[PDB]
Design a protein around this ligand. Structure first.
Ligand SMILES: CO[C@H]1[C@@H](OC)C[C@H](C)[C@@H](OC)C2=CC(=O)C=C(NC(=O)/C(C)=C/C=C\[C@H](C)[C@@H](OC(N)=O)/C(C)=C/[C@@H]1C)C2=O
Length: 258
């Protein structure tokens, strides 16, 4: 880690948070935009040589939430990043003084609408998350992890698990108790619909599906064991004459949002 980066990013985070705490939900517009840019870079190269896709022929954005772990993930099958691209790019942020432009914008009553164009849109994740773990894999390198904290502290290292992404970037956000509503189905759907206006690539959301049916009491007990479902809720009854139960089978599935 660099001291210049820790000072700049603290400022970027401070200004972005101070300006957009009433519009916190715009971090998703930025991450979808970044994902779309990473996809266009690998899509553009595939027109010259379709061998860049390799085993990963999917060109899309995937949004999923882990309500238990309080994590929201934004994955894309884009170009991905090399250790060099990551270190060099973080180096340009540190010595650019974009925070100065933003400070001046904020003090003048301007909006944070240029954070994307400036290349600092990523730091908007700190409006809703106190830690951001980026998993990335580019054809020309190994899979790396880039962890970022709300105190401008970061770390870059090789993924022990290996190339679990094949190609692209995964952005995991450890949400603040302050912004847990972003793990909700209705909220994410509303936000994705809103922020996927000029997006050329498909966006998929992993959301809950419920399959309800009447089952004979003895079979209902066996259905709890079905591992093809995340959970199986079986009706409780104090009535010993009841030969049947209402069973709710819950499984998360991918739905195209655009
Ligand atoms: C080779 O292009 C890389 C990247 O070089 C490492 C581009 C540069 C950082 C820069 O252009 C000069 C930006 C290109 C962008 O598209 C967006 C930016 N905005 C950001 O806030 C940051 C810090 C993005 C960084 C990584 C992001 C999580 C990445 O997002 C995803 N999903 O891969 C990202 C934008 C990686 C792109 C594809 C850039 O700086």
């Amino acid at each position: 880690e660099s001291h210049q980066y820790q000072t700049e990013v603290t400022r970027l985070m401070d200004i972005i948070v101070n300006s957009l705490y009433t519009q916190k939900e715009v971090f998703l517009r930025e991450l979808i935009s970044n994902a779309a840019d990473a996809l266009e870079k690998i899509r553009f190269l595939s027109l010259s040589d379709e061998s860049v896709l390799g085993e990963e022929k999917k060109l899309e954005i995937r949004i999923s939430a882990n309500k238990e772990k309080n994590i929201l993930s934004i994955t894309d099958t884009g170009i991905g990043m090399t250790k060099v691209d990551l270190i060099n790019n973080l180096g340009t942020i540190a010595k650019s003084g974009t925070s100065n432009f933003l400070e001046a914008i904020s003090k003048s009553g301007g909006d944070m609408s240029l954070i994307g164009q400036f290349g600092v849109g990523f730091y908007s994740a700190f409006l809703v998350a106190d830690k951001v773990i980026v998993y990335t894999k580019n054809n020309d390198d190994e899979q790396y992890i880039w962890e970022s904290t709300a105190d401008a502290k970061f770390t870059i290292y090789k993924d022990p698990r290996g190339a679990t992404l094949k190609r692209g970037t995964r952005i995991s956000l450890h949400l603040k108790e302050d912004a847990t509503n972003l793990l909700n189905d209705k909220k994410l759907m509303d936000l994705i619909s809103k922020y996927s206006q000029f997006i050329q690539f498909p966006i998929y959301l992993l959301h809950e599906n419920v399959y309800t049916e009447e089952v004979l009491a003895d079979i209902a007990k066996d259905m709890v064991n079905d591992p093809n479902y995340d959970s199986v809720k079986v009706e409780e009854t104090d009535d010993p004459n009841k030969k049947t139960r209402t069973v709710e089978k819950k499984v998360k599935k991918w739905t195209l949002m655009n």
